[PDB]
Write a protein that binds this ligand. Structure first.
Ligand SMILES: [Mg+2]
Ligand SMILES: [Mg+2]
Ligand SMILES: [Mg+2]
Ligand SMILES: [Mg+2]
Lengths: 232, 235
C-alpha cells in the first residue's frame, strides 16, 4: 500500500525514509494516511500504524513534523549527535496518523491532571515480525498504558498487526497476558525505567498502572483523532 | 574493605579491575573474599557482593575465572569484539563470592528441571547509589527470580546494600513491592527480554514467575556456596 523511499545509511545522519503512494505521489504519513484504512464501520475496527522504531532497535526514529511530507529520520541531541534510547525497544513502535495529543486538554486525576504530550498518539505493536522504518500496517487496538512522563500524559496504546498469526486470538488485555507472557508488564516496565540513565527519573502510570481495556483504548485514539481534525 | 587496582582504559579491551587487601596483597574476588563478611551467624545476615556491572551501564563486565586472581574485564564475542548487553541495566549487578551454580545437579519441577548455569550466583542490588566495577559491598538478601535461559537455571537474587537508606526497612519481596514500586517487575522484565535482540529468545521464569521470598533466596545462596566448597574438599 505505501512506498518507502529510503536514502542514506541507517546509522548515519543522512538516513531518511520518505513515503509515497503507489502512484509515485509523495504524501505525509501523519497528514494524508487515513487513520481508518477500511472506514470506521469495520469490525474488528482497524487503525493504521506508522512504524518509526522497528522491533529490536535502539535509534530514536520519528516522523519530522516540521518538514514537508513529514519524513522519518533519527532525532538529534543538541550536541548534534544521533539520539538513541539507553535500552533496546523489544517491539515495533510508532504512531497513529491523523492523531494529536492536544496539550490544551487536561486529564482527570486518574492521570494526575496531566496534559497532552503534543505529539501524534504513540502505539506499540506486539507482533513477532520485525517491521521496517516507515512501514504502514493496519492494527487492532488491544489496550493502553497511561504513562506520565514528567507531568505529561503520554499514552502507549497496545496493538497487534493484522496478519500476525495470533491476531484472531488477541482481543483484550487478558488475552495478551494469557498468550503472550511478559508483553504487557515488559512494555510497562520498559517505559517506566528507560529514562533512569538519561534523566535519573522513574516514570509513573495512571489508572493504577493498569492497561486500559481495548474498547477504552479505542476511545483514546478517537479523541486524539478529533484533536487532530480540530487542529486543521 | 578491599582495594581496587584499575588498569587499562575504560571501554577498551585492556580494561581490568583487580582486588587487593589493604596490605597490598592481591586476591581473587571469587576465591578469597568471604561470602559472609561477618560470618554466617551475623544478624541481620549479610552476604558480600562483588559488583561487576554498575547501575545504569551496559558493558558486560564479568570476573574472568580462568585468569589468575579472577579479575573483572569486559566479556568478548567470538568475533573478539567487546560484548555489551542490548539494553542498559538499571541496577548494580554482580555475583556472590565462593558460589558456583554446579550444573549436573537437577532442579525441581518448579524450575522445569533446569540445571545450574555453571557460573557464580548472580545478584541484583536495588539501592539508589551507583557502585563501582570491582566494588565489594555487604548486602541483605531480599528474594530471587528463577530465570530459565535455554534449559539453564539462572537465578537472579535480589538484595539491598547495607548503608542504603532503606536497608533496615527492606527484609522481603513484599517490602520492595511496597516501598519501591516497579523494582521487582522491572528486574523480571529486564532479564526476560534482554536477549531478544541478540538471540531472538524470550526467557522464562520458574515458580510461576514469582519472586521467591528472602528465606528461599537465602537457601539459593547457601546451596551455591556448598557447590563451590565441595570443589575445594579433600576425601
Ligand atoms: Mg511518539
Ligand atoms: Mg506520546
Ligand atoms: Mg554472573
Ligand atoms: Mg547466573
Amino acid at each position: 500500500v505505501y512506498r518507502r523511499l529510503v536514502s542514506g545509511t541507517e546509522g548515519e545522519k543522512d538516513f531518511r525514509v520518505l513515503l509515497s503512494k503507489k502512484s509515485g505521489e509523495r504524501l505525509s504519513p501523519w497528514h494524508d494516511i487515513p487513520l481508518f484504512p477500511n472506514g470506521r464501520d469495520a469490525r474488528p475496527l482497524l487503525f493504521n500504524m506508522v512504524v518509526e522504531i522497528p522491533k529490536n532497535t535502539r535509534r530514536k526514529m520519528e516522523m519530522q513534523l516540521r518538514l514537508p511530507f513529514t519524513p522519518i529520520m533519527q532525532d538529534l541531541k543538541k550536541d548534534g549527535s544521533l539520539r538513541e534510547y539507553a535500552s533496546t525497544l523489544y517491539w515495533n513502535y510508532g504512531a497513529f496518523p491523523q492523531t494529536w495529543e492536544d496539550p490544551r486538554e487536561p486529564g482527570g486525576r486518574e492521570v494526575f491532571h496531566a496534559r497532552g504530550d503534543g505529539d501524534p498518539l504513540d502505539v506499540v505493536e506486539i507482533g513477532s515480525e520485525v517491521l521496517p522504518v516507515g512501514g504502514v500496517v493496519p492494527v487492532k487496538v488491544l489496550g493502553a498504558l497511561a504513562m506520565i512522563d514528567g507531568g505529561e500524559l503520554d499514552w502507549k496504546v497496545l496493538a497487534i498487526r493484522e496478519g500476525d498469526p495470533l491476531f484472531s486470538q488477541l482481543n483484550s488485555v487478558a488475552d495478551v497476558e494469557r498468550l503472550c507472557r511478559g508483553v504487557v508488564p515488559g512494555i510497562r516496565e520498559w517505559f517506566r525505567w528507560y529514562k533512569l540513565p538519561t534523566d535519573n527519573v522513574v516514570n509513573q502510570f495512571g489508572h493504577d498502572e493498569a492497561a486500559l481495556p481495548a474498547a477504552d483504548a479505542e476511545r483514546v485514539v478517537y479523541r486524539a483523532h478529533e484533536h487532530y481534525l480540530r487542529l486543521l
